Amino acid sequence: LSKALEGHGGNRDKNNKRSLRRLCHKRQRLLRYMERKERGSGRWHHMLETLGLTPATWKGQITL
Amino acid sequence: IVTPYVRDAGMMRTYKPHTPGIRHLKRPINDHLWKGRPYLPLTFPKKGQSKGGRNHSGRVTVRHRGGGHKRRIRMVDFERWIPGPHTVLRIEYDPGRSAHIALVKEEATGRKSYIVAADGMRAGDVVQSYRSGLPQDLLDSMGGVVDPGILAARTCWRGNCLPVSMIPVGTQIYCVGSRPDGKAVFCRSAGTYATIISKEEETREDGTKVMTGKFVNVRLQSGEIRRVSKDACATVGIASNIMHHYRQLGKAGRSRWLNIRPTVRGLAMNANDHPHGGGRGKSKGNRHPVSPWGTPAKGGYKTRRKSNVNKWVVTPRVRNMGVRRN
RNA sequence: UCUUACUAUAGUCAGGACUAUAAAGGUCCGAACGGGUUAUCGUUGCAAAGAUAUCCGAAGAACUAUGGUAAGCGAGUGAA
RNA sequence: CGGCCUCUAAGUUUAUAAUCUGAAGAUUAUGACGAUGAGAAAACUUUGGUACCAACAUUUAAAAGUGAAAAUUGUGCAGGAAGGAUAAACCGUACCUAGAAUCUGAAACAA
RNA sequence: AUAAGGAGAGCUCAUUAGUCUCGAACGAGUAAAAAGGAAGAAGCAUGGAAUAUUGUUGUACGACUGUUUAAUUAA
RNA sequence: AUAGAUGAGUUUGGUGAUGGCUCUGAUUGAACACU
RNA sequence: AAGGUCAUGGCUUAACAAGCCAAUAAUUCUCUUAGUCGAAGCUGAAAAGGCUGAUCGACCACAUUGGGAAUGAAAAAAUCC
RNA sequence: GACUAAUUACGUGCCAGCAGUCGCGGCAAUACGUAAGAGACUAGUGUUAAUCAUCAUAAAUAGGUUUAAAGGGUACUCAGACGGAAAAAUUCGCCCAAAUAUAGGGGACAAUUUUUCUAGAGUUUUAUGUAAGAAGGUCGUACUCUAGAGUGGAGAGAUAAAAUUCUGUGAUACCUAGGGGACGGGUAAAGGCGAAGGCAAUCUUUUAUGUAAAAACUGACGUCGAAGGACGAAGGCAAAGGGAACAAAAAGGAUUAGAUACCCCAGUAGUCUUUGCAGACAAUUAUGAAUGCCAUAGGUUAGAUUUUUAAUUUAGUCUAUAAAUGAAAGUGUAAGCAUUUCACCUCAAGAGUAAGGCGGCAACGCAGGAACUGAAAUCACUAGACCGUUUCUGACACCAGCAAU
RNA sequence: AAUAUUUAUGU
Ligand SMILES: [K+]
Ligand SMILES: [K+]
Ligand SMILES: [K+]
Ligand SMILES: [K+]
Ligand SMILES: [K+]
Ligand SMILES: [K+]
Ligand SMILES: [K+]
Ligand SMILES: [K+]
Ligand SMILES: [K+]
Ligand SMILES: [Mg+2]
Ligand SMILES: [Mg+2]
Ligand SMILES: [Mg+2]
Ligand SMILES: [Mg+2]
Ligand SMILES: [Mg+2]
Ligand SMILES: [Mg+2]
Ligand SMILES: [Mg+2]
Ligand SMILES: [Mg+2]
Ligand SMILES: [Mg+2]
Ligand SMILES: [Mg+2]
Ligand SMILES: [Mg+2]
Ligand SMILES: [Mg+2]
Ligand SMILES: [Mg+2]
Ligand SMILES: [Mg+2]
Ligand SMILES: [Mg+2]
Ligand SMILES: [Mg+2]
Ligand SMILES: [Mg+2]
Ligand SMILES: [Mg+2]
Ligand SMILES: [Mg+2]
Ligand SMILES: [Mg+2]
Ligand SMILES: [Mg+2]
Ligand SMILES: [Mg+2]
Ligand SMILES: [Mg+2]
Ligand SMILES: [Mg+2]
Ligand SMILES: [Mg+2]
Ligand SMILES: [Mg+2]
Ligand SMILES: [Mg+2]
Ligand SMILES: [Mg+2]
Ligand SMILES: [Mg+2]
Ligand SMILES: [Mg+2]
Ligand SMILES: [Mg+2]
Ligand SMILES: [Mg+2]
Ligand SMILES: [Mg+2]
Ligand SMILES: [Mg+2]
Ligand SMILES: [Mg+2]
Ligand SMILES: [Mg+2]
Ligand SMILES: [Mg+2]
Ligand SMILES: [Mg+2]
Ligand SMILES: [Mg+2]
Ligand SMILES: [Mg+2]
Ligand SMILES: [Mg+2]
Ligand SMILES: [Mg+2]
Ligand SMILES: [Mg+2]
Ligand SMILES: [Mg+2]
Ligand SMILES: [Mg+2]
Ligand SMILES: [Mg+2]
Ligand SMILES: [Mg+2]
Ligand SMILES: [Mg+2]
Ligand SMILES: [Mg+2]
Ligand SMILES: [Mg+2]
Ligand SMILES: [Mg+2]
Ligand SMILES: [Mg+2]
Ligand SMILES: [Mg+2]
Ligand SMILES: [Mg+2]
Ligand SMILES: [Mg+2]
Ligand SMILES: [Mg+2]
Ligand SMILES: [Mg+2]
Ligand SMILES: [Mg+2]
Ligand SMILES: [Mg+2]
Structure with missing residues (x-):
């Protein structure tokens, strides 16, 4: 979706601007829970480095 | 962040208004233009007293001219007789012309030439002129004398020069000629173009029209639908620099660089130098607007010689009649 | 050979400052240079347009040099 | 070390041809002439950005600095000549440069 | 807008990271350039002589830089 | 501290609501008027 | 690490580290108003009631306004400069 | 006078005056001014000002926001409030229980934390269905322009009727051949889709939720949400395009007592494309979102199951009811019983106005008083009356005829 | 079955 809102005329798609914001927020609620539950287990670090999920994706407030 | x-x-x-003379300066953005010097052997200097508005007698025959920047004339090819592909090398800026010019190169021989660039024409484009006849490959591919639909699909491309008869109706052209073997004379200015209105043709019993007459009608930039020769040349597209007329010079000194000198009003003169001069204070003298030699400057007076009737006009221009446009 | 305009070929503009630029500005302060705001003097003057002070422009629509062109029935040139 | 000499600009032309024109003449082309520009070598000598030599800036004769010359690179638009090439004649050479005897201002003129 | 309005300035001197000089890392030096501080001295006075001619406010007119009656009107 | 919890007049042709105003209770470091 | 202290605390100092508080106003600023509190006074059936901040007691500030220091066990003055 | 215990007579006549509220006085006033009587308090009595209570009338105890003051345009979401099952550790919160209680006891509940569970919330299994959205292209019906030396040869169009207007430079009407713009007929339904705004021709490309059935998986990961940010109809500003049609404005013709207007001939911004600004709506279900729960019936939408004929069933939507609720109208998948959370309201009018501030190019938007003046504003219903309201019923009311003025 | 002139005032 982020790749589609950047293509030709992607800016005109102002209705799906909420869909991208709803996916990043739905993922923020799963990373915030998985962090305290997994207690930094090896299964939790494998997801971060593989998917490249930095703290900016769940720690603060995602403003889009 | 700073502006x-x-x-x-x-x-x-537009630029930062750090001076009162640069506040109203506005330029069109043409960054694709060649930044170097022109092709020297295709140019020659523009000097002499003619730059000041003088004729061979030495007296001013064109007012408000002189003192501009040194210039060189570019030998633009307005006929385009040589056939074969031509590779656009670069789009350059021509000071003595509103539109841009394109340095093309004949792949067959390698000779370079200048042509009025179209809107969107960039370096690398391949233009071709089918004015000297169609090449053997194109005729053989159809296998027949000509096909109007097939031809337009392989030759009606931006920058291609064709006879107006070969270009379909409704197409935009910007180098329209008048005579069968004459150069382009109409719509050569920036942003100008012409449309093909009608063609003197007839159906060939197979739905394929064939030219029957010797002329074709075209609407010019001024809105005049006149008659033009069947073999007259035309270039497909629009003249480049469409945003020319939106520019603003911003200061008086820029007009002086463009070889334009101050224009003194008639009201500012005395009764001896102009029909509008004289009177204490600002006064028009109840005199209808005229030129320094008595030519009506307003009201609809036409300066075209009466005896010189335009026999090529199908629909004359629309006269605004002094009514405000906006 | 003055002067106005244009034209060709050339030349000149200490230093400093601001501005987005190393260089993009009819930018700023100020010499040369170019102007001639105000006052005084002078008025058979040093001078048939000068002197002193003060003031304005000073990278520009700038200034300057050597040539060239356009003037006298109709008006040449003229930011008038 | 300039001129003379070669080349050409702006222009000029009772040169030639053609054309226009009450006469005088005018126009176009070519030629000739025309600097305020361009001209080999020497402390011995005889193609078009693969570009160009307008403005502005920058860099460059290796101890450093400074001022030129020429060139290098780049910037801005206002877009920036022409042509030719590549055993010592003739002419100029004295003085004056405007506060102290010389140029223009009627003059030995506070310009 | 260099708005306005203020501060500083010369001479002697403590002090010195580097550069430079000298002697033998270090030491010394301003008969090296600079930096430097709430230091100090003298006089009425240290932008010491000369050079750069006020500040602010309200209006009319013209946007502005420019141009004009050479030699009474520069607007 | 186990007796302590209350209403009334007024909107509408009229009814029922909503909602303010005023009255009924107690009081003042009070003032004024008649005493 | 050392001193200081009955003891504790950068309380103090040296040398390192770049933390600590806050994120919805921590912090700071301007304006309006006010002495604060108590079954102390008045009031309600009552509410961690409401209002007042007289006489009573406790606390704070002031002594024409502003700017300050010392003496003394202690400023806690209608003092003093 | 009534509230509020207590009466007559005379005088005055919307005058003079009374008045806390409603009010009284216009020639026979229990309301004003006298006289008398009566009711009541008393060295006090009234009035004015103020405070508490009245007032649940700023409602923590303890309110309310469909139609009466009051639900934000929207829901993603930081902070912050609230939120499962079965055990355990710590606090010793909570309770005995105080006196701001030393030290203890009790363990249901509460706080931080730990281990397990699957009913909440999610993920996978291409669902089906579907006008959410966006990109690049196209289709068609009509319209419009041009052309044919078209046929035809004097009318056409407009309106209640007309006029302005179009037409002999050949219109309207009937054709042929090209060009150009925006629009979206049927299907179509109480239908569906998105957070809302809103979304209806077509092909391809692209995009997040949601729904049904089965299993599987994670194991409370949830709901609400100030602000910030994002989205947000039409109209509008700005720039560049487009321009057939419609149409503010401006102008003309009618109508009319007058007619800016309603009607008509025409017509510019603008509607459309692209890029920004703007953020206000009866942005509505006049009803915030979410969770738990309560009895039936008849339709309808997309699925599932079945002896698929017809019956069960999940998630939506719409009518009519029960209990109940409501001022009533009505609602009854909620306007009921409860709960969570955010926003908002506190008599009318002044006023969503002023001033300062913030945002914007502007238009305007956000936020937001006080003074002066009032005792009323306001909602639903009831019965009438009225309607250039519908349908009936009587009348020389009308039509018709005769006679008359 | 898609018709459409004009109708102000009442201490
Ligand atoms: K200056
Ligand atoms: K002649
Ligand atoms: K001199
Ligand atoms: K002058
Ligand atoms: K709403
Ligand atoms: K315990
Ligand atoms: K588990
Ligand atoms: K209820
Ligand atoms: K106001
Ligand atoms: Mg769109
Ligand atoms: Mg002109
Ligand atoms: Mg002009
Ligand atoms: Mg003029
Ligand atoms: Mg004059
Ligand atoms: Mg005259
Ligand atoms: Mg006059
Ligand atoms: Mg200047
Ligand atoms: Mg004299
Ligand atoms: Mg100046
Ligand atoms: Mg020569
Ligand atoms: Mg020379
Ligand atoms: Mg002399
Ligand atoms: Mg002299
Ligand atoms: Mg002294
Ligand atoms: Mg001026
Ligand atoms: Mg000036
Ligand atoms: Mg003069
Ligand atoms: Mg003067
Ligand atoms: Mg009523
Ligand atoms: Mg006070
Ligand atoms: Mg007190
Ligand atoms: Mg009674
Ligand atoms: Mg009385
Ligand atoms: Mg009443
Ligand atoms: Mg009485
Ligand atoms: Mg007593
Ligand atoms: Mg809002
Ligand atoms: Mg609203
Ligand atoms: Mg316990
Ligand atoms: Mg399981
Ligand atoms: Mg589930
Ligand atoms: Mg599907
Ligand atoms: Mg005909
Ligand atoms: Mg016709
Ligand atoms: Mg189309
Ligand atoms: Mg809607
Ligand atoms: Mg449809
Ligand atoms: Mg849905
Ligand atoms: Mg939520
Ligand atoms: Mg918000
Ligand atoms: Mg809009
Ligand atoms: Mg718009
Ligand atoms: Mg526009
Ligand atoms: Mg109008
Ligand atoms: Mg009208
Ligand atoms: Mg219309
Ligand atoms: Mg926006
Ligand atoms: Mg909400
Ligand atoms: Mg149903
Ligand atoms: Mg529906
Ligand atoms: Mg119902
Ligand atoms: Mg109000
Ligand atoms: Mg305001
Ligand atoms: Mg508001
Ligand atoms: Mg009724
Ligand atoms: Mg009768
Ligand atoms: Mg009758
Ligand atoms: Mg009335």
Whole structure:
């Protein structure tokens, strides 16, 4: 979706601007829970480095 | 964040108003233009007293001219007789012309030439002129004398020069000629173009029209639908630099660089130098607007010689009649 | 050979400052240079347009040099 | 070390041809002439950005600095000549440069 | 807008990271350039002589830089 | 501290609501008027 | 690490580290108003009631306004400069 | 006078005056001014000002926001409030229980934390269905322009009727051949889709939720949400395009007592494309979102199951009811019983106005008083009356005829 | 079955 809102005329798609914001927020609620539950287990670090999920994706407030 | 010195908004360029003479300066953005010098052997200097508005007698025959920047004339090819592909090398800026010129190169021989660039024409484009006849491959591919639909699909491309008869109706052209073997004379200015209105043709019993007459009608930039020769040349597209007329010079000194000298009003003169001069204070003298030699400057007076009737006009221009447009 | 305009070929503009630029500005302060705001003097003057002070422009629509062109029935040139 | 000499600009032309024109003449082309520009070598000598030599800036004769010359690179638009090439004649050479005897201002003129 | 309005300035001197000099890392030096501080001295006075001619406010007119009656009107 | 919890007049042709105003209770470091 | 202290605390100092508080106003700023509190006074059936901040007691500030220091066990003055 | 215990007579006549509220006085006033009587308090009595209570009338105890003051345009979401099952550790919160209680006891509940569970919330299994959205292209019906030396040869169009207007430079009407713009007929329904705004021709490309059935998986990961940010109809500003049609404005013709207007001939911004600004709506279900729960019936939408004929069933939507609720109208998948959370309201009018401030190019938007003046504003219903309201019923009311003025 | 002139005032 982020790749589609950047293509030709992607800016005109102002209705799906909420869909991208709803996916990043739905993922923020799963990373915030998985962090305290997994207690930094090896299964939790494998997801971060593989998917490249930095703290900016769940720690603060995602403003889009 | 700080505002940049050069401010791009749309297709025009404006600058920081750090001086009163640069506040109203507006330029069209043409960054694809060649930044070097022109092809010297295709140019020659523009000097002499003619630059000041004088004729061979030495007296001013064109007022408000002189003192501009040194220039060189570019030998643009307005006929385009040589056939074969031509590779656009670069789009250059021509001071003695509103539109841009394109340095093309004949792949067959390698000779270079100048042509009025179209809107969107960039370096690398391959233009071709089918004015000297169609090449053997194109005729053989159809296998027949000509096909109007097939031809237009392989030759009606931007920058291609064709006889107006070969270009379909409704197409935009910008180098329209008049005579069968004459150069381009109409719509050569920046942003100008012409449309093909009608063609003197007839159906060939197979739905394929064939030219029957010797002329074709075209609507010019001024809105005049006149008659033009069947073999007259035309270039497909629109003249480049469409945002020319939106420019603003901003200061008086720029007009002086363009070889334009101050224009003194008639009211500012005395009763001996102009029909409008004289009177204490600002006064028009109850005299209808005229030129310094008595030519009506307003009201609809036409300066075209009466005896010189335009026998090529199908629909004359629309006269605004002095009514405000906006 | 003055002067106005144009034209060709050339030349000149200490230093400093601001501005987006190393260089993009009819930018700023100020010499040369170019102007001639105000006052005084002078008025058979040093001078048939000068002197002193003060003031304005000073990278520009700038200034300057050597040539060239356009003037006298109709008006040449003219930011008038 | 300039001129003379070669080349050409702006222009000029009772040169030639053609054309226009009450006469005088005018126009176009070519030629000739025309600097305020361009001209080999020497402390011995005889193609078009693969570009160009307008403005502005920068860099460059290796101890450093400074001022030129020429060139290098780049910037801005206002877009920036022409042509030719590549055993010592003739002419100029004295003085004056405007506060102290010389140029223009009627003059030995506070310009 | 260099708005306005203020501060500083010369001479002697403590002090010195580097550069430079000298002697033998270090030491010394301003008969090296600079930096430097709430230091100090003298006089009425240290932008010491000369050079750069006020500040602010309200209006009319013309946007502005420019141009004009050479030699009474520069607007 | 186990007796302590209350209403009334007024909107509408009229009814029922909503909602303010005023009255009924107690009081003042009070003032004024008649005493 | 050392001193200081009955003891504790950068309380103090040296040398390192770049933390600590806050994120919805921590912090700071301007304006309006006010002495604070108590079954102390008045009031309600009552509410961690409401109002007042007289006489009573406790606390704070002031002594024409502003700017300050010392003496003394202690400023806690209608003092003093 | 009534509230509020207590009466007559005379005088005055919307005058003079009374008045806390409603009010009284216009020639026979229990309301004003006298006289008398009566009711009541008393060295006090009234009035004015103020405070508490009245007032649940700023409602923590303890309110309310469909139609009466009051639900934000929207829901993603930081902070912050609230939120499962079965055990355990710590606090010793809570309770005995105080006196701001030393030290203890009790363990249901509460707080931080730990281990397990699957009913909440999610993920996978291409669902089906579907006008959410966006990109690049196209289709068609009509319209419009041009052309044919078209046929035809004097009318056409407009309106209640007309006029302005079009037409002999050949219109309207009937054709042929090209060009150009925006629009979206049927299907179509109480239908569906998105957070809302809103979304209806078509092909391809692209995009997040949601729904049904089965299993599987994670194992409370949830709901609400100030602000910030994002989205947000039409109209509008700005720039560049487009321009057939419609149409503010401006102008003309009618109508009319007058007619800016309603009607008509025409017509510019603008509607459309692209890029920004703007953020206000009867942005509505006049009803915030979410969770738990309560009895039936008849339709309808997309699925599932079945002896698929017809019956069960999940998630929506719409009518009519029960209990109940409501001022009533009505609602009854909620306007009921409860709960969570955010926003908002506190008599009318002044006023969503002023001033300062913030945002914007502007238009305007956000936020937001006080003074002066009032005792009323306001909602639903009831019965009438009225309607250039519908349908009936009587009348020389009308039509018709005769006679008359 | 898609018709459409004009109708102000009442201490
Ligand atoms: K200056
Ligand atoms: K002649
Ligand atoms: K001199
Ligand atoms: K002058
Ligand atoms: K709403
Ligand atoms: K315990
Ligand atoms: K588990
Ligand atoms: K209820
Ligand atoms: K106001
Ligand atoms: Mg769109
Ligand atoms: Mg002109
Ligand atoms: Mg002009
Ligand atoms: Mg003029
Ligand atoms: Mg004059
Ligand atoms: Mg005259
Ligand atoms: Mg006059
Ligand atoms: Mg200047
Ligand atoms: Mg004299
Ligand atoms: Mg100046
Ligand atoms: Mg020569
Ligand atoms: Mg020379
Ligand atoms: Mg002399
Ligand atoms: Mg002299
Ligand atoms: Mg002294
Ligand atoms: Mg001026
Ligand atoms: Mg000036
Ligand atoms: Mg003069
Ligand atoms: Mg003067
Ligand atoms: Mg009523
Ligand atoms: Mg006070
Ligand atoms: Mg007190
Ligand atoms: Mg009674
Ligand atoms: Mg009385
Ligand atoms: Mg009443
Ligand atoms: Mg009485
Ligand atoms: Mg007593
Ligand atoms: Mg809002
Ligand atoms: Mg609203
Ligand atoms: Mg316990
Ligand atoms: Mg399981
Ligand atoms: Mg589930
Ligand atoms: Mg599907
Ligand atoms: Mg005909
Ligand atoms: Mg016709
Ligand atoms: Mg189309
Ligand atoms: Mg809607
Ligand atoms: Mg449809
Ligand atoms: Mg849905
Ligand atoms: Mg939520
Ligand atoms: Mg918000
Ligand atoms: Mg809009
Ligand atoms: Mg718009
Ligand atoms: Mg526009
Ligand atoms: Mg109008
Ligand atoms: Mg009208
Ligand atoms: Mg219309
Ligand atoms: Mg926006
Ligand atoms: Mg909400
Ligand atoms: Mg149903
Ligand atoms: Mg529906
Ligand atoms: Mg119902
Ligand atoms: Mg109000
Ligand atoms: Mg305001
Ligand atoms: Mg508001
Ligand atoms: Mg009724
Ligand atoms: Mg009768
Ligand atoms: Mg009758
Ligand atoms: Mg009335």
